[PDB]
Amino acid sequence: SLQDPYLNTLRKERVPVSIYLVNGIKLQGQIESFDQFVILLKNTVSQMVWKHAISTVVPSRPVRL
Protein backbone atom coordinates (compact mmCIF):
# COMPACT_ATOMS: atom_id res chain seq x y z
CA SER A 1 0.00 0.00 0.00
CA LEU A 2 2.69 2.52 0.88
CA GLN A 3 5.76 1.49 -1.03
CA ASP A 4 4.11 1.31 -4.47
CA PRO A 5 2.97 4.99 -4.70
CA TYR A 6 6.20 6.08 -3.04
CA LEU A 7 8.47 4.23 -5.46
CA ASN A 8 6.22 5.22 -8.37
CA THR A 9 6.63 8.91 -7.52
CA LEU A 10 10.40 8.54 -7.27
CA ARG A 11 10.43 6.84 -10.67
CA LYS A 12 8.03 9.24 -12.38
CA GLU A 13 9.88 12.35 -11.21
CA ARG A 14 13.38 10.90 -11.83
CA VAL A 15 14.35 11.60 -8.22
CA PRO A 16 17.98 10.66 -7.45
CA VAL A 17 17.98 8.25 -4.50
CA SER A 18 20.42 6.51 -2.23
CA ILE A 19 19.54 2.87 -1.51
CA TYR A 20 21.15 1.40 1.60
CA LEU A 21 21.52 -2.36 1.68
CA VAL A 22 21.14 -4.59 4.72
CA ASN A 23 24.94 -4.75 4.99
CA GLY A 24 25.23 -0.94 4.98
CA ILE A 25 26.47 -0.58 1.39
CA LYS A 26 25.12 2.56 -0.28
CA LEU A 27 23.91 2.47 -3.89
CA GLN A 28 22.98 5.57 -5.88
CA GLY A 29 20.97 6.31 -8.99
CA GLN A 30 17.46 6.79 -10.30
CA ILE A 31 14.68 4.21 -10.05
CA GLU A 32 14.08 3.08 -13.64
CA SER A 33 11.50 0.41 -12.78
CA PHE A 34 10.37 -1.69 -9.83
CA ASP A 35 7.97 -4.42 -8.80
CA GLN A 36 7.11 -6.13 -5.52
CA PHE A 37 10.51 -7.89 -5.48
CA VAL A 38 13.22 -5.78 -7.16
CA ILE A 39 14.25 -2.26 -8.12
CA LEU A 40 16.07 -1.49 -11.37
CA LEU A 41 18.52 1.27 -10.42
CA LYS A 42 20.09 3.25 -13.24
CA ASN A 43 23.45 5.01 -12.95
CA THR A 44 26.23 4.11 -15.38
CA VAL A 45 24.71 0.62 -15.66
CA SER A 46 21.22 -0.73 -14.95
CA GLN A 47 21.74 -2.80 -11.81
CA MET A 48 18.97 -4.88 -10.29
CA VAL A 49 18.55 -4.60 -6.51
CA TRP A 50 16.53 -7.14 -4.54
CA LYS A 51 14.18 -5.52 -2.02
CA HIS A 52 14.90 -8.28 0.51
CA ALA A 53 18.42 -6.79 0.66
CA ILE A 54 17.28 -3.16 1.04
CA SER A 55 17.06 -1.41 4.38
CA THR A 56 16.10 2.12 3.37
CA VAL A 57 15.53 4.30 0.32
CA VAL A 58 16.54 7.93 0.85
CA PRO A 59 15.46 10.53 -1.74
CA SER A 60 17.97 13.27 -2.49
CA ARG A 61 15.29 15.95 -2.13
CA PRO A 62 11.95 16.29 -0.36
CA VAL A 63 9.21 14.73 -2.50
CA ARG A 64 5.49 15.49 -2.63
CA LEU A 65 3.46 12.28 -2.51
Query: Is residue 59 part of the contact set for a second copy (CB under 8 A)?
Result: yes
Contacts of 19 by beta carbon, 8 Å cutoff, 6+ apart: 26, 27, 28, 29, 39, 41, 49, 54, 56, 57, 58
The phi and psi torsions of 22 (rounded to 5 degrees) equal -65, -20
Query: Is residue 38 part of the contact set for Cl ion (CB under 5 A)?
Result: no
Residues within window 11-40 making contact with a second copy, judged by CB under 8 A: 20-25, 27, 33-35, 37-38, 40
Rule CB under 8 A: which residues touch a second copy? 1-3, 6-7, 20-25, 27, 33-35, 37-38, 40-41, 44-63, 65
